[PDB]
Structure formats: structure tokens, C-alpha cells
Amino acid sequence: NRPIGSFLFLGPTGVGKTELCKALANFMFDSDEAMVRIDMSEFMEKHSVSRLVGAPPGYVGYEEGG
Amino acid sequence: ERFGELDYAHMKELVLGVVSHNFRPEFINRIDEVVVFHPLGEQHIASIAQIQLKRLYKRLEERGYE
């Protein structure tokens, strides 16, 4: 009833974090883009749950789905 | 506003953050090179004036006026 892999990557950027995620994906689901990359740096304001999770009907984060 | 008194690479990063506000992150992660222009100065506009005068000379030479 819990998620399988929960981690926190702590270290400098671009060292292979993307490479590590793609290697995880390329073994566990056997493709590099068998995954989802989403940045959270753009979501400092109140428009985070309305842009990451799913938007209210008729506003900015709506017509891409979620 | 700010291409004066600022460097080149930090300008590219700053306007790339503006683009990340506009586009998708997975989109502009897939770009060769995001070249960012600068407004045109006086010598540039003198040269552009010479280019347009040359094409005007070609038009009025097909018309028959040197």
C-alpha cells in the first residue's frame, strides 16, 4: 500500500542524475524515456496544485491536461 | 532592458528562464542552441541603410535611372 521507490538525490546537478534516472528506467521498464521528468522549481506560488496536479476548469494550467 | 551593461551567458540563462515560463521544459531541453540577439546599433543601421540603397539601385536600374 506504499510507493516502491522514494528517494532524495543530494549532490551537484548534471553529474549523472538524469543518467541515473534513465538507467533506472532502462532496466526497470527497458527504455530511457520510460519515465517522467517534471521540474518543481517553477511552482513557488499558489499556482502549484492548479498547475501540477490538475487545473480548475477555465484557467492557465488546463489545456495540457495535467 | 538589460542587454546593455550585462554579459552574454547570464543573459542567455535569464531569457531562457523566461522561455521556461513560456514553453515546456522537456521542449527546450531538446534544442541545439538558443541564440539570443541584441538590438542594432548605429554602425549596423548605417550598413543596413547601404544594403537597402543597393537594392533600390537595382530596382531603379531595372527601371533605367542611375
* Cell 538558443, residue located: B34
CA distance A45 to A66: 17
Task: Decide if A42 and B26 are in contact by the 8 Å CB cutoff.
Answer: no
Task: Decide if B21 and A39 are in contact by the 8 Å CB cutoff.
Answer: no
B3 contacts B39 by C-beta, under 8 angstroms: yes
Query: How were these coordinates obtained?
Result: cryo-EM
Nearest CA in chain A to B29: A37
Instruction: Look at the alpha carbons of B10, B13, B17, B19 in this order and tell me if their dihedral is positive or negative.
Output: positive
Q: Is A6 exposed, middle or buried (0-12, 13-18, 19+ CB in 10 A)?
A: exposed
Nearest CA in chain B to A36: B26
CA distance A49 to A52: 5
Chain B residue numbers with beta carbons less than 8 Å from the beta carbon of A47 are: none
* Structural resolution in Å: 4.0
- Beta carbons within 8 Å of A50's beta carbon, 6+ residues apart: A56, A59, A60, A61
- Beta carbons within 8 Å of A27's beta carbon, 6+ residues apart: none
Q: What is the DSSP letter of A57?
A: T
